[PDB]
Design a protein around this nucleic acid. Structure first.
Length: 579
DNA sequence: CCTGACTCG
DNA sequence: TTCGAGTCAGG
């Protein structure tokens, strides 16, 4: 039972200085997507408005963009961006129920108002899926049904705001919401709407040459195999490798023989075909995903791609990036790295500027573990991979070979990911006895880290959750499971999540701080992407000088740890060249 | 729709 | 038997 006005014009009482607001975009990808309905709940009542009416109404547009008129919403970034595409500015968002629910427990996977309302036993609203349907059945219902749904969602936000704020404050997470996640949401909205320009002529030429190369590699594979087969089918491949060519079976999964890259690499002393197959599968992912998949999402008139940064998805506090994912563009092998030449500035005589934190997760470990040996290495700015190599090989710095440093590098990050002697041995393709010694030597050399790893797991068991620098939480109900596998996975999460999550906290704050400084100085430079521990901007070439000092400073000073933060930076004519 | 590839941090 | 993500082809 919920009364509301299905309005056909906007009225003054709909424009109160505090309201719950629903601006409904039903398509998952909200870029240039239709706004299907609006609802407003406030001191005076409950209202549904037709977009065609309200978004052409100067009074309502004015209210939307009035920062002193405060709106509570769910997924305000979706609304903000969909309104940008309609040429309308949204300001004054003071509470976002999606972000509030996300901070309280990311494991719930809240992605609609009803799922958030369930956290407080509020059931006077339906799930979106129930109203719109699934898949090919998805559709906007008749107006009265749509209107009641939107109003119920607004009414839920109105009543849930204080309960959610109260619990966040209780959890030491209220400032995390209002001073970090909510401001970051507006910045992400800017980045998404701006998009990144693509050189489609270059990308298409790369595609044509790549198709040629693919065919050649493919034919060479069939010649080595003695037969044609679908190389992209691990099942057919497994038959060729492990039945026809009788290569050793190093690993199986529940579906059959493994053909993972790690396995195929280890089979190179038995047959040369496995190196060719690895190459083929690399080339084929470049073609399918970074040529074809990317061209499919380029907006043809502007040649821009517009990612969506999911801010309320990951369990650690990171962002993710979808349709397209611009956080996994190739860089590690030169063949793929060239894809980055197709990402260019949106204006003439602008440049790409890219800044990355150096070893942020190891510095966070050093801080949280309060390990003096690790802290001192960073204080002196010694190479942390070379230092570990000295300890695990038990040699002097001069005796550390590049391959020893490489193995020490694997130990350094592997510790942060909970690696075992088995995993390390497989990773480095070395003796498991030697891998085990590397790890023992590591923990003997960094006792503060050993103690931290022990202590954090105990804390998780005692409290039921672990926390980051800025009070983000992750609950770990499995941490006391009697089952070894389930428990071990949760213990590794206890070790890793505070580290990855704290690093997330830092760069998020850096983005807020950097943006403030950009606007203060009236620079034209602006953010395009975040890639976990790096920030990518574009700017007129004239501003590089300033950015070279401003960006690293702001990023290094975002938070103060017990070790210093270090940021590297580069710029150039394309993303590729910003190296 | 799932699994197992490749891609990044 | 090393953490957090997304997309793709095959089945």
């Amino acid at each position: 039972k919920m009364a509301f006005t299905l309005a056909d014009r906007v009225t003054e009482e709909m424009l109160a200085d505090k309201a719950a607001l629903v601006v409904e975009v039903v398509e998952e990808n909200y870029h240039d997507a239709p706004i299907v309905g609006i609802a407003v709940v406030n001191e005076h009542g409950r209202f549904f408005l037709r977009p065609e009416t309200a978004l052409a109404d100067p009074q309502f547009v004015a209210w939307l963009g009035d920062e002193t008129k405060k709106k509570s919403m769910f997924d305000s970034k979706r609304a903000a961006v969909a309104l940008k595409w309609k040429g309308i500015e949204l300001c004054g968002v003071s509470f976002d129920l999606l972000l509030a629910a996300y901070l309280l427990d990311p494991a719930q996977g809240v992605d609609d108002v009803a799922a958030a309302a369930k956290m407080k036993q509020y059931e006077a609203v339906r799930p979106d899926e129930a109203v719109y349907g699934k898949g090919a059945k998805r559709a906007v219902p008749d107006e009265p049904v749509l209107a009641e749904h939107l109003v119920r969602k607004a009414a839920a936000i109105w009543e849930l705001e204080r309960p959610f704020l109260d619990e966040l404050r209780r959890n030491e997470q209220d400032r995390l919401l209002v001073e970090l996640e909510q401001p970051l949401s507006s910045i992400l909205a800017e980045m998404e709407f701006a998009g990144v320009k693509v050189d489609t002529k270059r990308l298409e030429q790369m595609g044509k040459e790549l198709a040629e190369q693919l065919g050649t590699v493919e034919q060479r594979i069939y010649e080595l195999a003695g037969q044609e087969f679908n190389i992209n089918s691990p099942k057919q491949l497994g038959v060729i490798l492990f039945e026809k060519l009788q290569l050793p079976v190093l690993k199986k999964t529940k579906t059959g023989y493994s053909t993972s890259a790690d396995v195929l690499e280890k089979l190179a002393p038995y047959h040369e075909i496995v190196e060719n197959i690895l190459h083929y599968r690399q080339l084929g992912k470049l073609q399918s995903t970074y040529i074809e998949g990317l061209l499919k999402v380029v907006r043809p008139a502007t040649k821009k791609v517009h990612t969506i940064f999911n801010q309320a998805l990951t369990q650690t506090g990171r962002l993710s990036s979808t349709e397209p994912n611009l956080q996994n563009i190739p860089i590690r092998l030169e063949e793929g790295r060239k894809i980055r030449q197709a990402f260019v500035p949106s204006e003439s005589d602008w440049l790409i500027f890219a800044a990355d934190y150096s070893q942020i997760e190891l510095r966070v470990l050093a801080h949280i573990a309060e390990d003096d040996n690790l802290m001192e290495a960073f204080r002196r700015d010694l190479d942390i991979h070379t230092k570990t190599a000295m300890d695990i090989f038990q040699v002097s710095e001069d005796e550390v070979t590049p391959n020893m440093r490489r193995q020490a590098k694997a130990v350094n990050y592997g510790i942060v990911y909970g690696i075992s002697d088995y995993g390390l041995a497989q990773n480095l393709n070395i003796s498991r006895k030697e891998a085990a010694e590397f790890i023992e030597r590591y923990f003997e050399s960094f006792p503060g880290v050993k103690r931290y790893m022990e202590n954090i797991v105990q804390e998780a068991k005692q409290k039921g959750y672990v926390t980051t620098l800025l009070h983000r939480r992750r609950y770990l109900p499995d941490i006391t499971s009697r089952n070894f596998n389930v428990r071990s996975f949760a213990e590794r999460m206890a070790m890793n999540t505070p580290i990855q999550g704290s690093a997330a906290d830092i760069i998020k704050k850096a983005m807020i701080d950097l943006n403030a400084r950009l606007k203060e100085e009236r620079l034209q430079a602006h953010l395009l992407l975040q890639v976990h521990d790096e920030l990518i901007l574009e700017a007129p070439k004239e501003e590089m000088e300033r950015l070279c000092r401003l960006v690293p400073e702001v990023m290094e000073q975002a938070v103060t740890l017990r070790v210093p933060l270090k940021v590297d930076y580069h710029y150039g004519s394309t993303w590729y060249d910003a190296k």
